[PDB]
Amino acid sequence: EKSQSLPFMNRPPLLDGSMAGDVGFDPLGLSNIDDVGIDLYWLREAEIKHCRVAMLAVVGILQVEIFGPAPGCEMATDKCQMDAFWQIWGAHPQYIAFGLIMIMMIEMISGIATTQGRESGERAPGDFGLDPLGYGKGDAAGYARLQAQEIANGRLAMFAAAGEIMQGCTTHQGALENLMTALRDNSF
Amino acid sequence: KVDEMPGATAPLGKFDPLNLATLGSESTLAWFRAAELKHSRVAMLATTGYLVQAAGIHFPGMLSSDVSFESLSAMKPLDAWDAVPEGGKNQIYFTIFLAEFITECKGTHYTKGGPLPTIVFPPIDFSTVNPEQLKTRQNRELNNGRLAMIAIMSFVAAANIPGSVPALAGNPMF
Amino acid sequence: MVGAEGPEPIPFAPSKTSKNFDPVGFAERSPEWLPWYREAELKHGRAAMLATVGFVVPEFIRVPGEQFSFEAIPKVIDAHDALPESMIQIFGWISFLEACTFPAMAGLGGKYDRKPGDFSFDPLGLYPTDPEKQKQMQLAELKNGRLAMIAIGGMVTGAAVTGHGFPYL
Amino acid sequence: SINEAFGISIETGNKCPPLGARILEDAQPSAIKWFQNAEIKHGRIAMVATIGYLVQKLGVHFPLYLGPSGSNCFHPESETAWLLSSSTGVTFSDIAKAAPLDAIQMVPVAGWMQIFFVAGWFESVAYYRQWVKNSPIPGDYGYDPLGFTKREGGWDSEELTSLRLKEIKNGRLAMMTIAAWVSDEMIPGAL
Amino acid sequence: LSSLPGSTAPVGPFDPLNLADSGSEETLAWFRASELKHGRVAMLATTGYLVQGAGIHFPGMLSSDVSFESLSAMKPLEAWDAVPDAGKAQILGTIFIAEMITESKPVHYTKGGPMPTMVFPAIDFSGVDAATLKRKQDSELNNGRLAMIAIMSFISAANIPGSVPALTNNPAF
Amino acid sequence: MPERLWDSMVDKTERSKAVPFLPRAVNLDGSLPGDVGFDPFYLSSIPKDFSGFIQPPQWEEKGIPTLYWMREAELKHCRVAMLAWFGWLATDGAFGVTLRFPGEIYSVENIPTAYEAHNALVSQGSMGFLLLAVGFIEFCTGAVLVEVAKGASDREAGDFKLDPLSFLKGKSEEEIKRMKTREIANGRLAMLAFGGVATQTALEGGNHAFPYF
Ligand code: CLA
Ligand code: CLA
Ligand code: CLA
Ligand code: CLA
Ligand code: CLA
Ligand code: CLA
Ligand code: CLA
Ligand code: KC1
């Protein structure tokens, strides 16, 4: 049986289309890793966390570069968010350190939930029970569509958040005016 | 196939002293009949187009914005082609090309078991469906075209070498 | 095997005949080197035959380039040292042709059935079909090839001592 | 085997001349196939070489126009000079002015590279259809635009063996002819 | 083949190089849709050069600083250059949605499905009398075949003068 | 004095078809499309597993045939050089239009010939992005050679399933082999053709522009 994404390659044996974004795209065989505290559960939890962090980072850039910083943080004034971080750190550094320790407690608890959820079987990877509106209660076909839409928007936002870091740390302008610069440079 | 085709007349029955009909295949003879007929139809328009341009009759009144029809009626018709504008000769060479491109690409080519080239535009072709009357008519197209092939070679042997024909070369047009 | 007939007497040695001519005796001292010796004799023979034509033809006609002219190089004997960029391209493409014969040189014994000197090279088909004059066709290549091995030493030193044209003085 | 090949005929008494026979008694059937092919091909260029000399010793350069002032065989001068090479400036009228042997020296180096490339294509089709596809007819290069070779078929018919012998012989005439016509361009030896 | 639309009276089916059998049936179906899209683009391109080359232009302002007065003053092939960069971004964006929608039909035209139909406004054209749609598909392709020669002649006349004899002293070229 | 490796490399019964005085290599069978028996240095008969360059032999016991590795490398050399010789000439205006990207980094006033385009865009940064984009495809397509070396895959060499216009959908095996031979033959010519253009412009005689002589 061949991979859908790479039809010249065989299907990776631990990927069977059960997870949401599974089209058999593992050419390096990384889903077969089972040694240094890392397996398919750990990589799926890492993918989903990289999905959700990058999804929030993209709209977190596009909120400030369109509507400005939040009130109490009007000292930013820079569209480059890699530089606007250091103006908030320059004036109100305690709230960033408030969030970074609040993340530190959340992430250390999530690291226990990952390794206890792997040893047992009562936790899907990336699952925290955070469904307060309750989309997962009915229409399992429509709930698997939301599981696939999270992965599809999250895999796209991974490139976008990594790009906005890198083309913010190299052009020092901001994402949306990097976009206008590219539009006038490559117009035909 | 040379027995079953037109061109056989009463003075010379099947005139082929070099036996070039049976030299190749039937596609070689079908190329030869398509080349005798195409040389016939060009030379028939050539013999007519030399005589009605040596008679002085012409179209009114201006061929181009700079070149009149009457300025080409004064010179000989073999030198009138040198004074046709380059944009006009390109118009002629395009419609001749587009007729030769169509007749060799209309289906079931003449070198195969197909018909000889017909009228490109407009496509009617005026042919009699009676095979006893049509066979004589295309026997008439060939030897009228055979005589016109000798005739236009006599018109260029009178316009290049002075003399070479008794009933011409005394005429300021031929 | 094919080169040992005669009568062809040895000059400056009036008693010896060239039939089975081997005074040092390489055939009995080392018979396993004999297919290597025939391959080496033919390669010495075929290179010396083109060297003889190549030493007398640029005396009269030259290739139309103007660094090969008579005004550029009148003598053939200094053309090797005067056209260095012309020699590397001869040396480079022979080096390619010689490198494709190393697996044939590595199997010159009883490895595979290639006769020494046989490169399967007969595009014009001039090798005869009957076998008894194939041997004299092989003998003609050896006798003309041995002669050009002698002659190219006489041609070069005949032109190095006496700078002159073709025959010599 | 050479004295029972195709190209022998009545004009040497139905046997091949002995010095030309002497090179090919003890030779392979590929040897007589090679020399038959090189005879026809040398006859093939030499036949084109005559008409290429007849329009060069005359002034029948481009453009061709059988009327007067049209650079035909009767009146060989032109009025248009159709510009063989625009970047050089040379026309077809300049070629017909100098000489038969000066004509090839006005053609630019890129002009011969267009000719030698499609001749290089053609000699590759000629080698494939004759030697790789080992055709039993010497010189049969698969080129028959009008389909003469579909005659009976095939090659074992009177019309093609007569045409094969007429081709070699008219190439045999033109081989000495261009050698004699370029002789008078080189040296007075019209004996 | 002849049962396909584009085969017509003078040369039908016209394929001297036998390009229809160079691939499979899905290759020919890609060749048909590409001929149909090259035709529709060039018919808009031949007319867009003929209309803007005369002086027919919209009244008013194209943008805040570019009117239609200045773009009609130029020959059309460089009139695209003075269109604003937000103007080509609007044009290329709707073509991107148009190319994405006609590709994402449930059966691909390479696999026998429908060729690109209208996106906005999305008039249905299914049951429009297959005999009349057969003749009108031939006139779509034949007018496409002629306009592709026409726009290639207009660009060739605009840069190499005298390439076409009918457009030598034309001031739009 | 040991048994010579010469015997395991050559056929010793058959001759090479392209070089008739040499014996045929053991792996050259005439099954591959461009096969005319041409291997005078016997590089198809090298007993090394060359997929060790991608995943080492110490990782697990695997082995790819040398002819499979060489054809996969020949086809990649063919397809790169066909695009590269075309890409060198199209950005130099050899086909009339000097094809450039709409950006002014790639304009002819910034980069005059394709000879100067490598060093100008390593410094700018376009070549570094190409090495990321190519290296992503090479990590995702080069791992099938490990799958072939383990005996798990029946993939032919250079045989991704990339026929987007489906020229070989319903075709027979001798016309697929003809089409695979035309890829190999045009690829082998374009490899020598790229060798011509990259070297003739690199001489101190010059002519960085077309026709590069
Ligand atoms: C040049 C064009 C041309 C062509 C292609 C043909 C072809 C044919 N003719 Mg026609 N013919 C022609 C001109 C031509 N003819 C002219 C001008 C005359 C009047 C003299 C005739 C009188 C004639 C008669 C009475 C008959 C034919 C017949 C035929 C058919 C017999 C097969 C054959 O032998 O082919 C010929 C092969 C060719 C390659 C064409 C000949 C071209 C030669 C080889 C070039 C050299 C000629 C040479 C320069 C002399 C010309 C001098 C010039 C200055 C006047 C064939 C279809 C026969 C027929 O139709 O049977 C049903 C038949 O009975 N022809
Ligand atoms: C990757 C995510 C991310 C990061 C690192 C930042 C970082 C920043 N934002 Mg941005 N922002 C984000 C997403 C993000 N934002 C999103 C999703 C939006 C809405 C679209 C915004 C809208 C926004 C506005 C309007 C402004 C900022 C501003 C800022 C800067 C100061 C704010 C601060 O330090 O709060 C301190 C941190 C906290 C108060 C708490 C953080 C959240 C905690 C950790 C809960 C997280 C829960 C998690 C999301 C889900 C549950 C996890 C687990 C149970 C599974 C800082 C650099 C301000 C600025 O200065 O711009 C220059 C500003 O005006 N942000
Ligand atoms: C053999 C081919 C031929 C060629 C190359 C020429 C070339 C020329 N002709 Mg001539 N001409 C010809 C034959 C030819 N003619 C024939 C057959 C006739 C009788 C109709 C004429 C009657 C004619 C007149 C009255 C005039 C010219 C003129 C000219 C000159 C320029 C204008 C033009 O091309 O219109 C020429 C028009 C044609 C060639 C149309 C014939 C071709 C058609 C499209 C195909 C068949 C149509 C149809 C069946 C009816 C006519 C055929 C038949 C009844 C004769 C140019 C030198 C002009 C000139 O300057 O004279 C000195 C001019 O005033 N021609
Ligand atoms: C160079 C072109 C060429 C070639 C390859 C051949 C080849 C052949 N001819 Mg042909 N032949 C030729 C030209 C050629 N001939 C010419 C110009 C004539 C006079 C019309 C003939 C007349 C002729 C007849 C009557 C016969 C042949 C036959 C043959 C075949 C038997 C071998 C032989 O007799 O020739 C041997 C070929 C050579 C010796 C090639 C070398 C050519 C010269 C000697 C090289 C040296 C040239 C020198 C440096 C300078 C030029 C001087 C020169 C112009 C005098 C062979 C296929 C016989 C046949 O067809 O049997 C089937 C036969 O009966 N030939
Ligand atoms: C975008 C270009 C394009 C494409 C993809 C097609 C495709 C097709 N044509 Mg169409 N055609 C075109 C342009 C095109 N055509 C133009 C401009 C004309 C007017 C000359 C025609 C006239 C025409 C006719 C009369 C017929 C077709 C037919 C066909 C079908 C033939 C089967 C085939 O496989 O050919 C594949 C074709 C290609 C792959 C074309 C690609 C371009 C080639 C490879 C190079 C061309 C360069 C060219 C020499 C430059 C000239 C410049 C130009 C301005 C003159 C196929 C769907 C037949 C049909 O519709 O049957 C259903 C049919 O009867 N065509
Ligand atoms: C004088 C000429 C004239 C013509 C030819 C028409 C013809 C038409 N009008 Mg009428 N109309 C006229 C005068 C005319 N009208 C006048 C003078 C007024 C002002 C009083 C109107 C006001 C009017 C209204 C309010 C409506 C029409 C509609 C129609 C269409 C009815 C048939 C149909 O549904 O086809 C199918 C429709 C078409 C072929 C038109 C295609 C339109 C394209 C796709 C663009 C759509 C743009 C639109 C604003 C999009 C809005 C939604 C979008 C934002 C999501 C028909 C095309 C109706 C219509 O089009 O509904 C479907 C309609 O609702 N007309
Ligand atoms: C071997 C192939 C090859 C390579 C290495 C290059 C290299 C280059 N090109 Mg050229 N080019 C090529 C072929 C190639 N070209 C071809 C075939 C064309 C069409 C004729 C072009 C058309 C072209 C233009 C118009 C221009 C260049 C330019 C350049 C330079 C910068 C491009 C860049 O960095 O943007 C990055 C490029 C991309 C991101 C494109 C996507 C590349 C993909 C990811 C490569 C792999 C996909 C491959 C095609 C198929 C994968 C097969 C696999 C799945 C098995 C660079 C030297 C520019 C220049 O500076 O000229 C002086 C320029 O203006 N190229
Ligand atoms: C039906 C479409 C059509 C139009 C609209 C049209 C128009 C003009 N043609 Mg005509 N024409 C054909 C058709 C058409 N022509 C066809 C099918 C043929 C081949 C049978 C043909 C032959 C010639 C020749 C020999 C000459 C020629 C000319 C002109 C010129 C008038 C003077 C001018 O304004 O320049 C105008 C614009 C003369 C010329 O172009 O001189 C440079 C000229 O010498 N044409």
Structure explained in plain terms:
- This is part of a larger assembly, with chains A (188 residues), B (174 residues), C (169 residues), D (191 residues), E (173 residues) and F (213 residues).
- Chain A has 5 helices and no strands.
- With 188 residues, chain A is mostly helical.
- The termini of chain A are far apart.
- Chain A is globular and about 55 Å long.
- Helices cover 55% and strands 0% of the residues of chain A.
- Chain B has 174 residues and is an all-alpha fold.
- Chain B contains 5 helices and no strands.
- In chain B, α1 crosses α5.
- Chain B is globular.
- With 169 residues, chain C is mainly α.
- Chain C has 6 helices and no strands.
- Chain C has helices at 26-29, 34-56, 79-82, 84-99, 102-105, 134-161.
- Chain D is mainly alpha-helical.
- In chain D, α2 packs across α6 (158-186).
- Chains in contact: A-E, A-F, B-D, B-E, C-D, C-F, E-F.
- The B-D interface holds B 22-25, 27-28, 31, 76, 78-79, 81-82, 111, 156-157, 159-161 and D 65-70, 72, 74-75, 79, 146-151, 159, 163.
- The structure holds chlorophyll A (7 copies) and Chlorophyll c1.
- One chlorophyll A binds at residues 2, 5, 7-8, 12, 14-16, 20-21, 32-33, 35-36, 39, 146, 149-150, 153 of chain B.
Reconstruct the topology from this structure.
This is part of a larger assembly, with chains A (188 residues), B (174 residues), C (169 residues), D (191 residues), E (173 residues) and F (213 residues).
Chain B: H1 26-54, H2 69-74, H3 77-80, H4 86-103, H5 131-159
Chain D: H1 18-22, H2 29-57, H3 92-98, H4 103-106, H5 109-132, H6 158-186
Chain F: H1 6-9, E1 10-15, E2 23-25, H2 66-90, H3 117-124, H4 126-141, H5 144-149, H6 173-200
Antiparallel strand pairs in F: 1-2
Helix pairs in contact in F: 2-6
Structural key phrases:
part of a larger assembly, 6 chains, B: 174 residues, mainly alpha, 5 helices, globular, E: 173 residues, 0% strand, binds chlorophyll A, binds Chlorophyll c1, electron transport
Helix/strand order of chain D: HHHHHH
- From the alpha carbons, calculate the radius of gyration of chain C and give it in angstroms: 19 Å
Number of helices of chain C: 6
Helix content of chain D: 40-55%
SS elements, strand count of chain D: 0
- Which hetero compounds are present in the coordinates? chlorophyll A, Chlorophyll c1
Oligomer: part of a larger assembly
Structure, briefly:
The structure is cut from a larger assembly and holds chains A (188 residues), B (174 residues), C (169 residues), D (191 residues), E (173 residues) and F (213 residues). Chain C contains six helices and no strands.
